[PDB]
């Protein structure tokens, strides 16, 4: 069997090939404890500390999956624009230290298109770390148009904490619970202004603290997800998910943009906000030319799509030639990845 | 084995790719025959692929391998029709060649086959101190400022090949990652990834009858023909007149022509054959042979390093385009 | 066509100038089979690329700002208000007529758009006469010359205006 | 020019002995002057300086700064935002507090000087 290790920004999703649900999702935070829930190795999608990523991968193979990595070929997920070298230290560790029989590296997003069932388009990937919009023509991204937004849920959960403390409810300590609020209550509007005017206290949902103290959130329900579309809230000048998708679709060829516009697939747990589809429908249908046909696609299983897109690849009889064998590695080195994994 | 029994299922394979892919099959099944493979390397560079498609298919009878191979290739070869618009393994092989062609001018550090031409191109309107780039710098000057046109035009009037260009509708600029490989996304080995430039989009009017791109369909993307090569000649004609008395001139001229050849394929202005199909012209060849210059137009002896880098490239574009389409089945068999 | 050119920069303001516009619509402009592809191949004879968009207004009246369905649908809709039984025929007897249907290519399209909207099993046939410009008239000539129609007329003594409902259709 | 009083704090906010206290004191001047209705804020933050709640008030200040970023500038908010996370205090080198308090006492004295009947102390004897 094969193993699929999506070392993500906040959670690592692992499982096997053929399956349809990560059999193990654990926070990637590292004599050493690298717990499922108990510093951060991958900061913004690029692995800053490698001596502690060995560990995320130790818990992955030996403790969460109880699998000896010596016998399973390993699929791995990189991020768009991994610094080239960081690809190199992924071929190294897996064969030199983990002695795997084989390996493959893929972009976290093409893989999301394959789970939306397509292989030509633009993907918007959000996560607890970087949010990137990645244009992919024919399975391979266009690296000159992959755009990066350094906004994610972390920044966003912390914004909710400000806005509720200001309301009156304070969360001083590590967790005095706002993530639950972020994904159980918050939504994205079509028009922030309409929803801000709505005197009604009807857009208020209430929840229980541990002890039974129920607090109420409203207004904040739709501002948190908006930091994404108007990040000046948080002190930023990068313009938002809506237009970043266009700015890229516009640094590409006139000839391929008909396809990219009709295939904008949302991925990431930062898109599980209800309403992130139609806002961007509004906001890209406006900026786009008027003769364009559009379909923003949000598959319902977007939380673990990068992984799902990996099972698919590994469930393919034809993906058995695309594995970097160790035999090959010993000769060239960690630079076979640039020659076999594009 | 099955791999190539799949990479030869590209509904987008062109003649160029077959050659690379098929020698790969032989190089691992067979393993002496290496000379044949070299011929296969030369015919490809010189674009006599046909001979080569035949020769691989004839060599699929001498050494009879696995019947997969023998029986496989023969059914795909005739359908192969080359496109100078989507020929890409040739772009990697051509853009990577100029790198080798230039490693060898770096080993001709005389760089003084260039000082004399300076004062010979300061006649059509700091010698080699920096190396090569100074000469890539002024090579352009030569052709672009010697004249936009109007001195090269009499030579062009003497040509019956220049009138046959096929270029057209400005389409725009596109920001790519390797120069000859105008295609932005061609899976690029990160071994060869350049800074993100902004590259032009050139368009082809196939309606100019007998257009170059119909005639030599193999040479990729050569909508036009090098117009400023004719004006390389004016500058070259003086040198030969002034320095015909130089003894080693074939070495020194070939140190210029070969550089134009490489830089043009290296910076993306043209392709081998667009620069070369002008130099192999009658009234232009006459100039050289009156001073006994026999030119070697960028044909090198180690063609191997580039060759493999191509077979493997075609291994990457195709297989992952073969799963690309297998997904396009398993989902259209879900929907 | 006026507005569209109005912004491609040519200006046809005067009355005589308006006739120029009519002249162009009448001929050069056409109905496109795949609008969208053709507004992407995009990227009196002063030339314009507003050739496929003018008649796309018939198919989608949104350009104009009209809230109504394309002639493609006014047709289907009308059809489904017809007995299921006679639909087979209506589908197989659809005739384009009138002058504005003289735009080249409305036919193949009418076929497509309706076809996909239509029962996956019915028979769709569009019949376009080249004389559609004047087809109404020709139609009437035949009749007036039909021997039998001669009594379907109204006598002056029969007139001796509510006979228009009861002797005529 | 006034842009030398602004640079001055862009440059005063970069010293290696700056702490939690000095920030609150310089910022207000910066807000009181970058702007020119917001009277309460310099009193709300004030009350907190006497109570040593530099912690919350730094943050409230840097909430006002953003909310009123309109009448302020990109530069002030940028700088101010960078310096705060990295703040600590050292009793030995917390000396602005000391002036305040030294000057405060003389203030509490006139007050007591304005409080006439001093018989209260006599009875304490």
JSON list of N, CA, C and O in Angstrom, two decimals, chain A residues 5-6 50 52 123 136 146 157 161 163 171 180 189 200 203 217 219 255 291 293 298 301-302 310 337:
[
{"chain": "A", "resi": 5, "resn": "UNK", "atom": "N", "xyz": [1.15, 11.71, 2.91]},
{"chain": "A", "resi": 5, "resn": "UNK", "atom": "CA", "xyz": [1.43, 12.63, 4.00]},
{"chain": "A", "resi": 5, "resn": "UNK", "atom": "C", "xyz": [1.33, 14.09, 3.66]},
{"chain": "A", "resi": 5, "resn": "UNK", "atom": "O", "xyz": [2.29, 14.66, 3.19]},
{"chain": "A", "resi": 6, "resn": "UNK", "atom": "N", "xyz": [0.20, 14.71, 3.93]},
{"chain": "A", "resi": 6, "resn": "UNK", "atom": "CA", "xyz": [-0.01, 16.13, 3.64]},
{"chain": "A", "resi": 6, "resn": "UNK", "atom": "C", "xyz": [0.43, 16.94, 4.80]},
{"chain": "A", "resi": 6, "resn": "UNK", "atom": "O", "xyz": [-0.33, 17.16, 5.71]},
{"chain": "A", "resi": 50, "resn": "UNK", "atom": "N", "xyz": [14.11, 21.53, 9.87]},
{"chain": "A", "resi": 50, "resn": "UNK", "atom": "CA", "xyz": [13.99, 20.21, 9.36]},
{"chain": "A", "resi": 50, "resn": "UNK", "atom": "C", "xyz": [14.25, 19.18, 10.39]},
{"chain": "A", "resi": 50, "resn": "UNK", "atom": "O", "xyz": [13.89, 18.05, 10.22]},
{"chain": "A", "resi": 52, "resn": "UNK", "atom": "N", "xyz": [12.99, 19.15, 13.08]},
{"chain": "A", "resi": 52, "resn": "UNK", "atom": "CA", "xyz": [11.76, 18.96, 13.81]},
{"chain": "A", "resi": 52, "resn": "UNK", "atom": "C", "xyz": [10.63, 18.57, 12.89]},
{"chain": "A", "resi": 52, "resn": "UNK", "atom": "O", "xyz": [9.51, 18.48, 13.30]},
{"chain": "A", "resi": 123, "resn": "UNK", "atom": "N", "xyz": [-6.99, 27.13, -8.85]},
{"chain": "A", "resi": 123, "resn": "UNK", "atom": "CA", "xyz": [-7.41, 26.63, -7.57]},
{"chain": "A", "resi": 123, "resn": "UNK", "atom": "C", "xyz": [-7.09, 27.66, -6.52]},
{"chain": "A", "resi": 123, "resn": "UNK", "atom": "O", "xyz": [-6.10, 28.32, -6.63]},
{"chain": "A", "resi": 136, "resn": "UNK", "atom": "N", "xyz": [-3.32, 26.39, -12.99]},
{"chain": "A", "resi": 136, "resn": "UNK", "atom": "CA", "xyz": [-2.79, 25.13, -13.49]},
{"chain": "A", "resi": 136, "resn": "UNK", "atom": "C", "xyz": [-3.27, 24.85, -14.86]},
{"chain": "A", "resi": 136, "resn": "UNK", "atom": "O", "xyz": [-4.44, 24.67, -15.03]},
{"chain": "A", "resi": 146, "resn": "UNK", "atom": "N", "xyz": [1.26, 32.04, -10.04]},
{"chain": "A", "resi": 146, "resn": "UNK", "atom": "CA", "xyz": [0.86, 31.57, -8.76]},
{"chain": "A", "resi": 146, "resn": "UNK", "atom": "C", "xyz": [1.02, 32.72, -7.84]},
{"chain": "A", "resi": 146, "resn": "UNK", "atom": "O", "xyz": [2.11, 33.23, -7.68]},
{"chain": "A", "resi": 157, "resn": "UNK", "atom": "N", "xyz": [-8.54, 33.81, 13.44]},
{"chain": "A", "resi": 157, "resn": "UNK", "atom": "CA", "xyz": [-9.04, 33.46, 14.76]},
{"chain": "A", "resi": 157, "resn": "UNK", "atom": "C", "xyz": [-8.63, 34.50, 15.72]},
{"chain": "A", "resi": 157, "resn": "UNK", "atom": "O", "xyz": [-9.39, 34.89, 16.56]},
{"chain": "A", "resi": 161, "resn": "UNK", "atom": "N", "xyz": [-10.86, 37.11, 18.30]},
{"chain": "A", "resi": 161, "resn": "UNK", "atom": "CA", "xyz": [-10.58, 37.35, 19.69]},
{"chain": "A", "resi": 161, "resn": "UNK", "atom": "C", "xyz": [-10.55, 38.82, 20.01]},
{"chain": "A", "resi": 161, "resn": "UNK", "atom": "O", "xyz": [-10.98, 39.21, 21.07]},
{"chain": "A", "resi": 163, "resn": "UNK", "atom": "N", "xyz": [-12.20, 41.17, 18.37]},
{"chain": "A", "resi": 163, "resn": "UNK", "atom": "CA", "xyz": [-13.53, 41.71, 18.20]},
{"chain": "A", "resi": 163, "resn": "UNK", "atom": "C", "xyz": [-14.57, 41.26, 19.16]},
{"chain": "A", "resi": 163, "resn": "UNK", "atom": "O", "xyz": [-15.65, 41.82, 19.18]},
{"chain": "A", "resi": 171, "resn": "UNK", "atom": "N", "xyz": [-10.81, 36.73, 26.04]},
{"chain": "A", "resi": 171, "resn": "UNK", "atom": "CA", "xyz": [-10.09, 35.51, 25.96]},
{"chain": "A", "resi": 171, "resn": "UNK", "atom": "C", "xyz": [-8.63, 35.79, 26.09]},
{"chain": "A", "resi": 171, "resn": "UNK", "atom": "O", "xyz": [-7.91, 35.73, 25.12]},
{"chain": "A", "resi": 180, "resn": "UNK", "atom": "N", "xyz": [-14.11, 27.39, 17.02]},
{"chain": "A", "resi": 180, "resn": "UNK", "atom": "CA", "xyz": [-15.40, 26.74, 16.93]},
{"chain": "A", "resi": 180, "resn": "UNK", "atom": "C", "xyz": [-16.33, 27.78, 16.48]},
{"chain": "A", "resi": 180, "resn": "UNK", "atom": "O", "xyz": [-17.20, 27.53, 15.70]},
{"chain": "A", "resi": 189, "resn": "UNK", "atom": "N", "xyz": [-20.63, 37.17, 3.33]},
{"chain": "A", "resi": 189, "resn": "UNK", "atom": "CA", "xyz": [-21.75, 37.82, 2.74]},
{"chain": "A", "resi": 189, "resn": "UNK", "atom": "C", "xyz": [-21.70, 37.88, 1.27]},
{"chain": "A", "resi": 189, "resn": "UNK", "atom": "O", "xyz": [-20.85, 37.27, 0.68]},
{"chain": "A", "resi": 200, "resn": "UNK", "atom": "N", "xyz": [-31.91, 44.20, 13.83]},
{"chain": "A", "resi": 200, "resn": "UNK", "atom": "CA", "xyz": [-32.70, 43.02, 14.05]},
{"chain": "A", "resi": 200, "resn": "UNK", "atom": "C", "xyz": [-32.30, 42.00, 15.06]},
{"chain": "A", "resi": 200, "resn": "UNK", "atom": "O", "xyz": [-33.14, 41.18, 15.41]},
{"chain": "A", "resi": 203, "resn": "UNK", "atom": "N", "xyz": [-29.36, 38.21, 13.36]},
{"chain": "A", "resi": 203, "resn": "UNK", "atom": "CA", "xyz": [-28.15, 37.62, 12.93]},
{"chain": "A", "resi": 203, "resn": "UNK", "atom": "C", "xyz": [-27.31, 37.43, 14.16]},
{"chain": "A", "resi": 203, "resn": "UNK", "atom": "O", "xyz": [-26.16, 37.82, 14.19]},
{"chain": "A", "resi": 217, "resn": "UNK", "atom": "N", "xyz": [-22.60, 36.15, 19.79]},
{"chain": "A", "resi": 217, "resn": "UNK", "atom": "CA", "xyz": [-21.79, 36.74, 18.74]},
{"chain": "A", "resi": 217, "resn": "UNK", "atom": "C", "xyz": [-22.66, 37.16, 17.60]},
{"chain": "A", "resi": 217, "resn": "UNK", "atom": "O", "xyz": [-23.50, 36.40, 17.18]},
{"chain": "A", "resi": 219, "resn": "UNK", "atom": "N", "xyz": [-22.57, 40.29, 14.17]},
{"chain": "A", "resi": 219, "resn": "UNK", "atom": "CA", "xyz": [-21.75, 41.30, 13.52]},
{"chain": "A", "resi": 219, "resn": "UNK", "atom": "C", "xyz": [-20.45, 40.69, 13.22]},
{"chain": "A", "resi": 219, "resn": "UNK", "atom": "O", "xyz": [-19.98, 40.78, 12.13]},
{"chain": "A", "resi": 255, "resn": "UNK", "atom": "N", "xyz": [-5.37, 33.25, -24.37]},
{"chain": "A", "resi": 255, "resn": "UNK", "atom": "CA", "xyz": [-5.90, 32.02, -24.91]},
{"chain": "A", "resi": 255, "resn": "UNK", "atom": "C", "xyz": [-6.32, 30.93, -23.94]},
{"chain": "A", "resi": 255, "resn": "UNK", "atom": "O", "xyz": [-7.11, 30.07, -24.28]},
{"chain": "A", "resi": 291, "resn": "UNK", "atom": "N", "xyz": [-18.38, 38.76, -21.28]},
{"chain": "A", "resi": 291, "resn": "UNK", "atom": "CA", "xyz": [-18.77, 37.69, -22.16]},
{"chain": "A", "resi": 291, "resn": "UNK", "atom": "C", "xyz": [-18.30, 36.42, -21.56]},
{"chain": "A", "resi": 291, "resn": "UNK", "atom": "O", "xyz": [-18.35, 35.38, -22.16]},
{"chain": "A", "resi": 293, "resn": "UNK", "atom": "N", "xyz": [-17.93, 33.12, -19.05]},
{"chain": "A", "resi": 293, "resn": "UNK", "atom": "CA", "xyz": [-18.78, 32.15, -18.41]},
{"chain": "A", "resi": 293, "resn": "UNK", "atom": "C", "xyz": [-18.02, 31.69, -17.25]},
{"chain": "A", "resi": 293, "resn": "UNK", "atom": "O", "xyz": [-16.86, 31.37, -17.39]},
{"chain": "A", "resi": 298, "resn": "UNK", "atom": "N", "xyz": [-17.04, 24.67, -5.38]},
{"chain": "A", "resi": 298, "resn": "UNK", "atom": "CA", "xyz": [-16.68, 24.37, -4.03]},
{"chain": "A", "resi": 298, "resn": "UNK", "atom": "C", "xyz": [-17.07, 23.01, -3.61]},
{"chain": "A", "resi": 298, "resn": "UNK", "atom": "O", "xyz": [-18.15, 22.84, -3.10]},
{"chain": "A", "resi": 301, "resn": "UNK", "atom": "N", "xyz": [-16.22, 18.55, 0.25]},
{"chain": "A", "resi": 301, "resn": "UNK", "atom": "CA", "xyz": [-15.27, 17.81, 1.05]},
{"chain": "A", "resi": 301, "resn": "UNK", "atom": "C", "xyz": [-14.00, 18.53, 1.01]},
{"chain": "A", "resi": 301, "resn": "UNK", "atom": "O", "xyz": [-12.96, 17.91, 1.06]},
{"chain": "A", "resi": 302, "resn": "UNK", "atom": "N", "xyz": [-14.05, 19.83, 0.89]},
{"chain": "A", "resi": 302, "resn": "UNK", "atom": "CA", "xyz": [-12.86, 20.60, 0.74]},
{"chain": "A", "resi": 302, "resn": "UNK", "atom": "C", "xyz": [-11.87, 20.59, 1.88]},
{"chain": "A", "resi": 302, "resn": "UNK", "atom": "O", "xyz": [-10.71, 20.92, 1.68]},
{"chain": "A", "resi": 310, "resn": "UNK", "atom": "N", "xyz": [-4.64, 13.00, -3.45]},
{"chain": "A", "resi": 310, "resn": "UNK", "atom": "CA", "xyz": [-3.49, 12.12, -3.44]},
{"chain": "A", "resi": 310, "resn": "UNK", "atom": "C", "xyz": [-3.83, 10.66, -3.51]},
{"chain": "A", "resi": 310, "resn": "UNK", "atom": "O", "xyz": [-3.14, 9.93, -4.18]},
{"chain": "A", "resi": 337, "resn": "UNK", "atom": "N", "xyz": [14.51, 14.69, -8.14]},
{"chain": "A", "resi": 337, "resn": "UNK", "atom": "CA", "xyz": [13.16, 15.20, -7.98]},
{"chain": "A", "resi": 337, "resn": "UNK", "atom": "C", "xyz": [12.84, 16.25, -8.98]},
{"chain": "A", "resi": 337, "resn": "UNK", "atom": "O", "xyz": [11.69, 16.46, -9.31]}
]
